[PDB]
Amino acid sequence: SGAIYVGNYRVVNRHLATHNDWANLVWEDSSRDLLVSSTTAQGCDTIARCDCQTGVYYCSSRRKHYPVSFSKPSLIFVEASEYYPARYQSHLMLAVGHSEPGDCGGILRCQHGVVGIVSTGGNGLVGFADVRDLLWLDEE
Ligand SMILES: CSc1ccccc1CC(=O)N1CC[C@](O)(c2c[nH]nn2)C1
Ligand SMILES: [Zn+2]
């Protein structure tokens, strides 16, 4: 579980998106595992606009924030699960770290702000859906 609240938007994992997210959809991308929906109140999370490769992420399976080195967003092959088949997910960044399915939504952050949220995992690796290129989230 977990979301980003920036302006009048809510960013969640497309596979965890609620009924109310679809009844107010703004943008969604199955290959990115991202879904943006509309909120009534203003959000206060700042999105990082940078090329940072070091940061801190929340892991709910450990009630802990872990510092990590992560690769740049890339087209990475992801194992088949009950939400998606085995395919290449785009804008994905991998780090060596603990990750469990219920961890999806935990924010990855650098000194510039919010980099993304947990999307993939297993094998002692944790994958994050980058949001630093969705420049429109700030404006409108
Ligand atoms: C943190 S995910 C994880 C952690 C430990 C083990 C396995 C996983 C993978 C998983 O169960 N899923 C469920 C949907 C998934 O998040 C996904 C796929 N593509 N985009 N989102 C991958
Ligand atoms: Zn940064």
CSV table of N, CA and C and ligand atoms in Angstrom, one decimal:
chain,number,residue,atom,x,y,z
A,1,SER,N,0.8,-1.2,0.0
A,1,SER,CA,0.0,0.0,0.0
A,1,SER,C,0.9,1.3,0.0
A,2,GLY,N,0.4,2.4,-0.5
A,2,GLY,CA,1.1,3.6,-0.6
A,2,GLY,C,0.9,4.5,-1.8
A,3,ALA,N,0.8,5.9,-1.5
A,3,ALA,CA,0.6,6.9,-2.6
A,3,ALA,C,1.4,8.2,-2.5
A,4,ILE,N,1.5,8.9,-3.6
A,4,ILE,CA,2.1,10.2,-3.7
A,4,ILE,C,1.0,11.2,-3.9
A,5,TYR,N,1.0,12.3,-3.1
A,5,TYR,CA,0.0,13.3,-3.2
A,5,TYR,C,0.7,14.6,-3.6
A,6,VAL,N,0.6,15.0,-4.9
A,6,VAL,CA,1.2,16.1,-5.5
A,6,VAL,C,0.1,17.0,-6.2
A,7,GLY,N,-0.1,18.2,-5.7
A,7,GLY,CA,-1.2,19.1,-6.2
A,7,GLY,C,-2.6,18.6,-6.1
A,8,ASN,N,-3.3,18.5,-7.2
A,8,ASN,CA,-4.7,17.9,-7.2
A,8,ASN,C,-4.6,16.4,-7.8
A,9,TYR,N,-3.5,15.7,-7.7
A,9,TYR,CA,-3.2,14.3,-8.1
A,9,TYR,C,-2.9,13.3,-7.0
A,10,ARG,N,-3.2,12.0,-7.2
A,10,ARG,CA,-2.8,10.9,-6.4
A,10,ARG,C,-2.1,9.9,-7.3
A,11,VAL,N,-0.9,9.6,-6.9
A,11,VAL,CA,-0.1,8.6,-7.7
A,11,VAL,C,0.0,7.3,-6.9
A,12,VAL,N,-0.6,6.2,-7.4
A,12,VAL,CA,-0.5,4.8,-6.8
A,12,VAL,C,0.1,3.8,-7.8
A,13,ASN,N,0.2,2.5,-7.4
A,13,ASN,CA,0.6,1.4,-8.2
A,13,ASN,C,-0.7,1.0,-9.0
A,14,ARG,N,-0.6,1.0,-10.3
A,14,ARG,CA,-1.8,0.7,-11.2
A,14,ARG,C,-2.5,-0.6,-10.7
A,15,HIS,N,-1.8,-1.6,-10.3
A,15,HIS,CA,-2.3,-3.0,-9.8
A,15,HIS,C,-3.1,-2.9,-8.5
A,16,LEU,N,-2.8,-1.9,-7.6
A,16,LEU,CA,-3.4,-1.6,-6.3
A,16,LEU,C,-4.5,-0.4,-6.4
A,17,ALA,N,-4.7,0.1,-7.6
A,17,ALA,CA,-5.6,1.2,-7.8
A,17,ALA,C,-7.1,0.9,-7.4
A,18,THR,N,-7.7,1.7,-6.5
A,18,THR,CA,-9.0,1.5,-5.9
A,18,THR,C,-10.2,1.8,-6.9
A,19,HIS,N,-11.5,1.5,-6.6
A,19,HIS,CA,-12.6,1.8,-7.4
A,19,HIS,C,-12.7,3.3,-7.7
A,20,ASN,N,-12.5,4.1,-6.6
A,20,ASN,CA,-12.5,5.6,-6.6
A,20,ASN,C,-11.4,6.2,-7.5
A,21,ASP,N,-10.2,5.5,-7.7
A,21,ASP,CA,-9.1,6.0,-8.5
A,21,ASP,C,-9.6,6.0,-10.0
A,22,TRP,N,-10.3,4.9,-10.4
A,22,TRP,CA,-10.8,4.8,-11.7
A,22,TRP,C,-12.0,5.7,-12.0
A,23,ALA,N,-12.9,5.9,-11.0
A,23,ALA,CA,-14.0,6.9,-11.1
A,23,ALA,C,-13.5,8.3,-11.2
A,24,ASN,N,-12.2,8.6,-11.2
A,24,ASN,CA,-11.6,9.9,-11.3
A,24,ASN,C,-10.2,9.8,-12.0
A,25,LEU,N,-10.0,8.9,-12.9
A,25,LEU,CA,-8.7,8.6,-13.6
A,25,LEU,C,-8.2,9.8,-14.3
A,26,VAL,N,-6.9,10.1,-14.3
A,26,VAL,CA,-6.2,11.2,-15.0
A,26,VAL,C,-5.3,10.5,-16.1
A,27,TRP,N,-4.4,9.6,-15.6
A,27,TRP,CA,-3.5,8.9,-16.5
A,27,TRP,C,-3.2,7.5,-15.9
A,28,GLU,N,-3.0,6.5,-16.8
A,28,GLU,CA,-2.6,5.2,-16.3
A,28,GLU,C,-1.6,4.6,-17.3
A,29,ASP,N,-0.7,3.7,-16.9
A,29,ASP,CA,0.2,3.0,-17.8
A,29,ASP,C,0.5,1.7,-17.3
A,30,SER,N,-0.1,0.6,-17.9
A,30,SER,CA,0.1,-0.7,-17.4
A,30,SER,C,1.6,-1.1,-17.5
A,31,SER,N,2.4,-0.8,-18.6
A,31,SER,CA,3.8,-1.1,-18.7
A,31,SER,C,4.7,-0.4,-17.7
A,32,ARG,N,4.2,0.7,-17.1
A,32,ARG,CA,4.9,1.4,-16.1
A,32,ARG,C,4.4,1.1,-14.7
A,33,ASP,N,3.2,0.4,-14.5
A,33,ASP,CA,2.5,0.1,-13.2
A,33,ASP,C,2.2,1.4,-12.5
A,34,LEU,N,1.8,2.5,-13.3
A,34,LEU,CA,1.4,3.7,-12.6
A,34,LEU,C,0.0,4.2,-12.9
A,35,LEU,N,-0.7,4.7,-11.9
A,35,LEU,CA,-2.1,5.3,-12.1
A,35,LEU,C,-2.2,6.5,-11.4
A,36,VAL,N,-2.5,7.6,-12.0
A,36,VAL,CA,-2.7,8.9,-11.4
A,36,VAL,C,-4.3,9.2,-11.4
A,37,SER,N,-4.8,9.6,-10.3
A,37,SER,CA,-6.2,10.0,-10.2
A,37,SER,C,-6.4,11.4,-9.5
A,38,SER,N,-7.7,11.9,-9.6
A,38,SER,CA,-7.9,13.3,-9.1
A,38,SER,C,-8.4,13.3,-7.6
A,39,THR,N,-7.8,14.3,-6.8
A,39,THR,CA,-8.2,14.5,-5.4
A,39,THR,C,-8.8,16.0,-5.3
A,40,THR,N,-9.5,16.1,-4.2
A,40,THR,CA,-10.2,17.4,-3.9
A,40,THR,C,-9.3,18.4,-3.2
A,41,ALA,N,-8.5,17.9,-2.3
A,41,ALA,CA,-7.6,18.7,-1.5
A,41,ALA,C,-6.2,18.7,-2.2
A,42,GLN,N,-5.4,19.8,-1.8
A,42,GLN,CA,-4.1,19.9,-2.3
A,42,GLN,C,-3.1,19.0,-1.6
A,43,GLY,N,-2.2,18.4,-2.4
A,43,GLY,CA,-1.1,17.5,-1.9
A,43,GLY,C,0.1,18.4,-1.7
A,44,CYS,N,1.0,17.8,-0.9
A,44,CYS,CA,2.2,18.6,-0.5
A,44,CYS,C,3.5,17.8,-0.8
A,45,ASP,N,3.5,16.7,-1.5
A,45,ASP,CA,4.8,16.0,-1.8
A,45,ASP,C,5.4,16.7,-3.0
A,46,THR,N,6.7,16.9,-2.9
A,46,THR,CA,7.5,17.5,-4.0
A,46,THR,C,8.1,16.4,-4.8
A,47,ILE,N,8.0,16.4,-6.2
A,47,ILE,CA,8.6,15.4,-7.0
A,47,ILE,C,10.1,15.8,-7.3
A,48,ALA,N,11.0,14.9,-7.2
A,48,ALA,CA,12.4,15.2,-7.5
A,48,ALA,C,12.5,15.4,-9.1
A,49,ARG,N,13.2,16.5,-9.5
A,49,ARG,CA,13.5,16.7,-10.9
A,49,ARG,C,15.1,16.7,-11.1
A,50,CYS,N,15.6,15.4,-11.2
A,50,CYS,CA,17.0,15.1,-11.1
A,50,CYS,C,17.4,13.8,-11.7
A,51,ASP,N,18.7,13.5,-11.7
A,51,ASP,CA,19.3,12.2,-12.1
A,51,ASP,C,20.0,11.5,-11.0
A,52,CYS,N,19.5,11.6,-9.7
A,52,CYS,CA,20.0,11.0,-8.5
A,52,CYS,C,20.0,9.5,-8.6
A,53,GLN,N,21.0,8.9,-8.2
A,53,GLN,CA,21.1,7.4,-8.1
A,53,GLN,C,21.3,6.8,-6.7
A,54,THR,N,21.1,7.7,-5.7
A,54,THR,CA,21.1,7.3,-4.3
A,54,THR,C,19.9,8.0,-3.6
A,55,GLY,N,19.3,7.2,-2.6
A,55,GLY,CA,18.2,7.7,-1.9
A,55,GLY,C,17.7,6.9,-0.7
A,56,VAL,N,16.5,7.1,-0.2
A,56,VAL,CA,16.0,6.3,0.9
A,56,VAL,C,14.5,5.8,0.6
A,57,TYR,N,14.2,4.6,0.9
A,57,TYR,CA,12.9,4.1,0.6
A,57,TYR,C,12.2,3.4,1.8
A,58,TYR,N,10.8,3.6,1.9
A,58,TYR,CA,10.1,2.9,3.0
A,58,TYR,C,9.8,1.5,2.6
A,59,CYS,N,10.0,0.5,3.6
A,59,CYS,CA,9.7,-0.9,3.4
A,59,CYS,C,8.7,-1.2,4.6
A,60,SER,N,7.4,-1.3,4.3
A,60,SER,CA,6.4,-1.6,5.4
A,60,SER,C,6.6,-3.1,6.0
A,61,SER,N,7.2,-4.0,5.2
A,61,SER,CA,7.5,-5.3,5.7
A,61,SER,C,8.5,-5.4,6.9
A,62,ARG,N,9.2,-4.2,7.1
A,62,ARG,CA,10.3,-4.1,8.1
A,62,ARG,C,10.1,-2.9,9.0
A,63,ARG,N,9.0,-2.1,8.8
A,63,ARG,CA,8.7,-0.8,9.4
A,63,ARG,C,10.0,0.1,9.4
A,64,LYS,N,10.7,0.1,8.3
A,64,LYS,CA,12.0,0.7,8.1
A,64,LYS,C,12.3,1.4,6.8
A,65,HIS,N,13.1,2.5,6.9
A,65,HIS,CA,13.6,3.3,5.8
A,65,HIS,C,15.0,2.9,5.5
A,66,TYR,N,15.3,2.5,4.3
A,66,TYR,CA,16.6,2.0,3.9
A,66,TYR,C,17.4,2.9,2.9
A,67,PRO,N,18.6,3.3,3.1
A,67,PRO,CA,19.4,4.0,2.1
A,67,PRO,C,19.8,3.0,0.9
A,68,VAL,N,19.6,3.4,-0.3
A,68,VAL,CA,19.9,2.6,-1.5
A,68,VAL,C,20.6,3.3,-2.6
A,69,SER,N,21.3,2.6,-3.4
A,69,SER,CA,21.9,3.0,-4.7
A,69,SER,C,21.0,2.3,-5.7
A,70,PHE,N,20.4,3.0,-6.7
A,70,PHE,CA,19.5,2.4,-7.6
A,70,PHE,C,19.9,2.8,-9.1
A,71,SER,N,19.6,1.9,-10.1
A,71,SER,CA,20.0,2.2,-11.4
A,71,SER,C,19.0,3.2,-12.1
A,72,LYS,N,19.4,3.8,-13.2
A,72,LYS,CA,18.5,4.8,-13.9
A,72,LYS,C,17.3,4.1,-14.5
A,73,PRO,N,16.1,4.8,-14.7
A,73,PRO,CA,14.9,4.1,-15.2
A,73,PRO,C,15.2,3.4,-16.5
A,74,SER,N,14.9,2.1,-16.6
A,74,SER,CA,15.2,1.2,-17.7
A,74,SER,C,14.1,0.2,-18.1
A,75,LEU,N,14.2,-0.4,-19.2
A,75,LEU,CA,13.2,-1.4,-19.6
A,75,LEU,C,13.7,-2.8,-19.0
A,76,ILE,N,13.1,-3.2,-17.9
A,76,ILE,CA,13.5,-4.4,-17.1
A,76,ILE,C,12.5,-5.5,-17.2
A,77,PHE,N,12.9,-6.7,-17.4
A,77,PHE,CA,12.0,-7.9,-17.4
A,77,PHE,C,11.6,-8.2,-15.9
A,78,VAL,N,10.3,-8.4,-15.7
A,78,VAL,CA,9.7,-8.6,-14.4
A,78,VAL,C,9.0,-10.0,-14.4
A,79,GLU,N,9.1,-10.8,-13.4
A,79,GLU,CA,8.4,-12.1,-13.3
A,79,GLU,C,6.9,-12.0,-13.4
A,80,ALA,N,6.2,-13.0,-13.9
A,80,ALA,CA,4.8,-13.1,-13.9
A,80,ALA,C,4.3,-13.2,-12.4
A,81,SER,N,3.2,-12.6,-12.1
A,81,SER,CA,2.5,-12.6,-10.8
A,81,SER,C,1.0,-12.7,-11.1
A,82,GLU,N,0.1,-12.4,-10.0
A,82,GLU,CA,-1.3,-12.5,-10.3
A,82,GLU,C,-1.9,-11.2,-10.9
A,83,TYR,N,-1.1,-10.1,-10.9
A,83,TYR,CA,-1.5,-8.8,-11.4
A,83,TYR,C,-1.1,-8.5,-12.8
A,84,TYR,N,0.1,-9.0,-13.2
A,84,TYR,CA,0.6,-8.9,-14.6
A,84,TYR,C,1.2,-10.2,-15.0
A,85,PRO,N,1.2,-10.4,-16.4
A,85,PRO,CA,2.0,-11.6,-16.8
A,85,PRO,C,3.6,-11.2,-16.9
A,86,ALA,N,4.4,-12.2,-17.3
A,86,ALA,CA,5.9,-12.0,-17.4
A,86,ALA,C,6.1,-11.0,-18.5
A,87,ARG,N,6.6,-9.8,-18.3
A,87,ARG,CA,6.8,-8.8,-19.3
A,87,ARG,C,7.9,-7.8,-19.0
A,88,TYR,N,8.2,-6.8,-19.9
A,88,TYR,CA,9.2,-5.8,-19.6
A,88,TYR,C,8.4,-4.5,-19.1
A,89,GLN,N,8.7,-4.1,-17.9
A,89,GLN,CA,8.2,-2.9,-17.3
A,89,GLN,C,9.1,-1.8,-17.6
A,90,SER,N,8.6,-0.6,-18.1
A,90,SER,CA,9.4,0.5,-18.4
A,90,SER,C,9.6,1.5,-17.2
A,91,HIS,N,10.6,2.4,-17.2
A,91,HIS,CA,10.9,3.4,-16.2
A,91,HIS,C,11.2,2.8,-14.8
A,92,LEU,N,11.7,1.6,-14.8
A,92,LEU,CA,12.0,0.8,-13.6
A,92,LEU,C,13.4,1.0,-13.1
A,93,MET,N,13.6,1.1,-11.8
A,93,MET,CA,14.9,1.3,-11.2
A,93,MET,C,15.1,0.2,-10.2
A,94,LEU,N,16.2,-0.6,-10.2
A,94,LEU,CA,16.5,-1.6,-9.3
A,94,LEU,C,17.5,-1.3,-8.3
A,95,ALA,N,17.3,-1.7,-7.0
A,95,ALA,CA,18.3,-1.6,-5.9
A,95,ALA,C,18.4,-3.0,-5.1
A,96,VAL,N,19.5,-3.2,-4.5
A,96,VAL,CA,19.7,-4.4,-3.6
A,96,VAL,C,19.0,-4.1,-2.3
A,97,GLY,N,17.9,-4.8,-2.0
A,97,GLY,CA,17.2,-4.5,-0.8
A,97,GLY,C,16.0,-5.4,-0.6
A,98,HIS,N,15.5,-5.5,0.7
A,98,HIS,CA,14.3,-6.3,1.0
A,98,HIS,C,13.1,-5.6,0.4
A,99,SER,N,12.2,-6.5,-0.2
A,99,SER,CA,11.0,-6.0,-0.8
A,99,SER,C,10.0,-7.2,-0.7
A,100,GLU,N,8.7,-7.0,-0.3
A,100,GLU,CA,7.6,-7.9,-0.2
A,100,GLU,C,6.4,-7.4,-1.0
A,101,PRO,N,5.5,-8.1,-1.6
A,101,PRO,CA,4.3,-7.5,-2.3
A,101,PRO,C,3.6,-6.4,-1.7
A,102,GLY,N,3.3,-6.5,-0.4
A,102,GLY,CA,2.6,-5.4,0.3
A,102,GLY,C,3.4,-4.2,0.6
A,103,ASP,N,4.6,-4.2,0.1
A,103,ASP,CA,5.5,-3.0,0.2
A,103,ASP,C,5.3,-2.0,-1.0
A,104,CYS,N,4.7,-2.4,-2.1
A,104,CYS,CA,4.3,-1.6,-3.3
A,104,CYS,C,3.7,-0.3,-2.8
A,105,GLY,N,4.2,0.8,-3.1
A,105,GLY,CA,3.6,2.1,-2.7
A,105,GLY,C,4.6,2.9,-1.8
A,106,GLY,N,5.5,2.2,-1.1
A,106,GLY,CA,6.6,2.9,-0.4
A,106,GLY,C,7.4,3.8,-1.2
A,107,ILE,N,7.6,5.0,-0.8
A,107,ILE,CA,8.2,6.1,-1.5
A,107,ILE,C,9.8,6.0,-1.5
A,108,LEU,N,10.4,6.2,-2.7
A,108,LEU,CA,11.8,6.3,-2.8
A,108,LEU,C,12.1,7.9,-2.9
A,109,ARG,N,13.0,8.4,-2.1
A,109,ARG,CA,13.3,9.8,-2.1
A,109,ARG,C,14.7,10.1,-2.0
A,110,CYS,N,15.1,11.2,-2.6
A,110,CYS,CA,16.5,11.7,-2.6
A,110,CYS,C,16.5,13.1,-1.9
A,111,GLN,N,17.6,13.9,-2.0
A,111,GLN,CA,17.6,15.2,-1.5
A,111,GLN,C,16.6,16.2,-2.2
A,112,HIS,N,16.3,15.9,-3.5
A,112,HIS,CA,15.5,16.7,-4.4
A,112,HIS,C,14.0,16.5,-4.2
A,113,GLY,N,13.6,15.4,-3.7
A,113,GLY,CA,12.2,15.0,-3.4
A,113,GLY,C,11.9,13.6,-3.6
A,114,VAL,N,10.7,13.4,-4.1
A,114,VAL,CA,10.1,12.1,-4.4
A,114,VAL,C,10.5,11.6,-5.8
A,115,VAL,N,11.3,10.5,-5.8
A,115,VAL,CA,11.8,9.8,-7.0
A,115,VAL,C,10.7,8.8,-7.6
A,116,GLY,N,10.1,8.0,-6.8
A,116,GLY,CA,9.1,7.1,-7.2
A,116,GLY,C,8.5,6.3,-6.1
A,117,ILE,N,7.9,5.1,-6.4
A,117,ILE,CA,7.3,4.2,-5.5
A,117,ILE,C,7.7,2.7,-5.8
A,118,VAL,N,7.7,1.8,-4.7
A,118,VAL,CA,8.0,0.3,-4.9
A,118,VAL,C,6.9,-0.3,-5.9
A,119,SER,N,7.4,-1.1,-6.9
A,119,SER,CA,6.7,-1.7,-7.9
A,119,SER,C,7.0,-3.2,-8.1
A,120,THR,N,8.3,-3.5,-8.2
A,120,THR,CA,8.7,-4.9,-8.3
A,120,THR,C,9.6,-5.4,-7.1
A,121,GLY,N,9.9,-6.7,-7.0
A,121,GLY,CA,10.7,-7.3,-5.9
A,121,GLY,C,11.1,-8.7,-6.0
A,122,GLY,N,11.5,-9.3,-4.9
A,122,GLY,CA,12.0,-10.7,-4.9
A,122,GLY,C,13.4,-10.9,-5.2
A,123,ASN,N,14.0,-12.0,-4.7
A,123,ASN,CA,15.5,-12.3,-4.9
A,123,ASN,C,16.4,-11.3,-4.3
A,124,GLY,N,15.9,-10.6,-3.2
A,124,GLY,CA,16.8,-9.6,-2.5
A,124,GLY,C,17.0,-8.3,-3.3
A,125,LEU,N,16.1,-8.0,-4.3
A,125,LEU,CA,16.1,-6.8,-5.1
A,125,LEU,C,14.7,-6.1,-4.9
A,126,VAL,N,14.7,-4.8,-5.0
A,126,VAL,CA,13.5,-4.0,-4.9
A,126,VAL,C,13.5,-3.1,-6.1
A,127,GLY,N,12.3,-3.1,-6.8
A,127,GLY,CA,12.2,-2.2,-8.0
A,127,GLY,C,11.2,-1.1,-7.8
A,128,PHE,N,11.6,0.1,-8.3
A,128,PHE,CA,10.8,1.4,-8.1
A,128,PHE,C,10.4,1.9,-9.5
A,129,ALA,N,9.1,2.3,-9.5
A,129,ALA,CA,8.5,3.0,-10.7
A,129,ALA,C,8.9,4.5,-10.6
A,130,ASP,N,9.8,5.0,-11.5
A,130,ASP,CA,10.2,6.4,-11.6
A,130,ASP,C,9.0,7.3,-12.0
A,131,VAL,N,8.9,8.5,-11.3
A,131,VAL,CA,7.9,9.5,-11.6
A,131,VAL,C,8.5,10.9,-11.9
A,132,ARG,N,9.9,11.0,-11.9
A,132,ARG,CA,10.7,12.2,-12.1
A,132,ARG,C,10.5,12.9,-13.5
A,133,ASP,N,10.0,12.1,-14.5
A,133,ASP,CA,9.7,12.6,-15.9
A,133,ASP,C,8.3,13.0,-16.1
A,134,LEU,N,7.4,12.8,-15.2
A,134,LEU,CA,6.0,13.2,-15.3
A,134,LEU,C,5.9,14.7,-14.8
A,135,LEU,N,6.5,15.6,-15.6
A,135,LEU,CA,6.6,17.1,-15.3
A,135,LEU,C,5.3,17.7,-15.1
A,136,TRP,N,4.2,17.2,-15.8
A,136,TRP,CA,2.9,17.8,-15.7
A,136,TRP,C,2.3,17.7,-14.3
A,137,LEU,N,2.7,16.7,-13.5
A,137,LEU,CA,2.2,16.5,-12.1
A,137,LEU,C,2.2,17.8,-11.3
A,138,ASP,N,3.2,18.7,-11.5
A,138,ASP,CA,3.4,19.9,-10.8
A,138,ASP,C,2.4,21.0,-11.2
A,139,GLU,N,2.2,21.2,-12.5
A,139,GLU,CA,1.4,22.2,-13.1
A,139,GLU,C,-0.1,21.8,-13.3
A,140,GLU,N,-1.0,22.7,-13.8
A,140,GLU,CA,-2.5,22.5,-14.0
A,140,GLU,C,-3.2,22.5,-12.7
B,1,LIG,C1,7.4,-5.6,-4.3
B,1,LIG,S1,6.8,-6.8,-5.5
B,1,LIG,C2,7.5,-8.3,-4.9
B,1,LIG,C3,8.2,-8.5,-3.7
B,1,LIG,C4,8.6,-9.7,-3.3
B,1,LIG,C5,8.4,-10.8,-4.1
B,1,LIG,C6,7.8,-10.7,-5.4
B,1,LIG,C7,7.3,-9.4,-5.8
B,1,LIG,C8,6.6,-9.3,-7.1
B,1,LIG,C9,5.1,-9.2,-6.9
B,1,LIG,O1,4.5,-10.0,-6.2
B,1,LIG,N1,4.5,-8.3,-7.7
B,1,LIG,C10,3.0,-8.0,-7.6
B,1,LIG,C11,2.8,-7.0,-8.7
B,1,LIG,C12,4.1,-6.3,-8.9
B,1,LIG,O2,4.3,-5.3,-8.0
B,1,LIG,C13,4.4,-5.7,-10.3
B,1,LIG,C14,4.9,-6.4,-11.4
B,1,LIG,N2,5.1,-5.4,-12.3
B,1,LIG,N3,4.7,-4.2,-11.9
B,1,LIG,N4,4.3,-4.4,-10.6
B,1,LIG,C15,5.1,-7.5,-8.7
B,2,ZN,ZN,17.7,13.9,-6.5
